[PDB]
Amino acid sequence: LLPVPYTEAASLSTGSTVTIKGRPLACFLNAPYLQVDFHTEMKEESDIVFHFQVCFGRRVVMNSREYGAWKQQVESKNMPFQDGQEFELSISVLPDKYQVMVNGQSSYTFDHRIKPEAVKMVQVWRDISLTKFNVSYLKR
Amino acid sequence: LLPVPYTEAASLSTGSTVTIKGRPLACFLNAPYLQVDFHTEMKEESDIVFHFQVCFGRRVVMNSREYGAWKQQVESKNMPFQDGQEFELSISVLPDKYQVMVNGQSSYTFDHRIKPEAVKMVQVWRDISLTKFNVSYLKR
Ligand SMILES: OC[C@H]1O[C@@](CO)(O[C@H]2O[C@H](CO)[C@@H](O)[C@H](O)[C@H]2O)[C@@H](O[C@H]2O[C@H](CO)[C@@H](O)[C@H](O)[C@H]2O)[C@@H]1O
Ligand SMILES: OC[C@H]1O[C@@](CO)(O[C@H]2O[C@H](CO)[C@@H](O)[C@H](O)[C@H]2O)[C@@H](O[C@H]2O[C@H](CO)[C@@H](O)[C@H](O)[C@H]2O)[C@@H]1O
């Protein structure tokens, strides 16, 4: 129901959660992707404080793009996403890192390189359909 | 106007041309992809006689997937696609190879590994919108 690429203005801080519900657009044999980027401005050319890219069935990479340039990639072969299935992805902002839950299971983390307060936009794109996108804030 | 992923039943032989008109869904800085697969069956899990994958602004790879397994990739750094622009892609079936034209300029070729008569379906997907898809036949 939600158009992909999906772009939403957003603010993040400790206690924020970004929740995404979606489905890959192809079987895992054909290697669909999912990408979630937390941007510093509304323009898609802007810096990316948190880049999260799934190659379904193979691996996840995370990185940041700072003053136009990609930094050191983190790779994970953890693959909790299931072939042909809807997924629910939860990205929580903790004081020290993002925690990424997939279908309720802690699956990835990524230490902050730029403060989350620098985020102004979230983009969700590549080979998925989307049925839910929510940013929720629970102050500690 | 045409939904992506786009799938169409198709038959190919010498003199067939597949013409695609579309636009990337993101600026080249964000590395959108385009993928065109000529399949041996309507199911997307089926073998791929010709796989054509553009990482816009970086490179093109071509390959085949035969009895479930990818063969030897061919890589080209030729990049005639222009950032932010609509493209027109022409794939022509010659006796010995596919010839790929981009905006009227010969840009890639790929020798036949499986006869084109094995194709039953064409899928166009990843990070593009599509305004035209045509399969046309001119017998020599
Ligand atoms: O500008 C995109 C270009 O940069 C490469 C490195 O050359 O990757 C960077 O950008 C990716 C997002 O598009 C990001 O996922 C990477 O973490 C970041 O380094 C290049 O990707 C190629 O190299 C990376 C490894 O650095 C591979 O993950 C990827 O498969 C390659 O295509 C991007 O095209
Ligand atoms: O099954 C997909 C898986 O296979 C890899 C090789 O491990 O690539 C094959 O499939 C690609 C289409 O998804 C096709 O483009 C390749 O030609 C084919 O070898 C893997 O891709 C990784 O390795 C290839 C190089 O072989 C890189 O082009 C790619 O960036 C890598 O992600 C696919 O995930």
Curated annotation (Swiss-Prot), chains A, B:
Residues 4-136 form the Galectin domain. Expressed abundantly in the bone marrow. Expressed exclusively by eosinophils and basophils. Not detected in monocytes and neutrophils. Expressed in CD25-positive regulatory T-cells (Treg) (at protein level). Found in intestinal tissue from patients with Celiac disease, expression is directly related to the histological grade of mucosal damage and to the number of eosinophils found in the duodenal lesion (at protein level). Found in sputum of patients with eosinophilic inflammatory diseases such as asthma (at protein level). One of its GO terms (molecular function) is carbohydrate binding. It comes from the Eukaryota. Pfam families: Gal-bind_lectin. Keywords: Acetylation, Cytoplasm, Lectin. The record marks N134 as: Not glycosylated. One of its GO terms (biological process) is regulation of T cell cytokine production. It is found in: Cytoplasm, Cytosol; Cytoplasmic granule. InterPro entries: ConA-like_dom_sf, Galectin-like, Galectin_CRD. Gene3D superfamilies: 2.60.120.200. SMART domains: Gal-bind_lectin (SM00908), GLECT (SM00276). One of its GO terms (cellular component) is cytosol. The keyword Glycosyltransferase does not apply. Forms hexagonal bipyramidal crystals, known as Charcot-Leyden crystals, in tissues and secretions from sites of eosinophil-associated inflammation and some myeloid leukemias. Interacts with CEL. Regulates immune responses through the recognition of cell-surface glycans. Essential for the anergy and suppressive function of CD25-positive regulatory T-cells (Treg). This is Galectin-10. It comes from Homo sapiens.
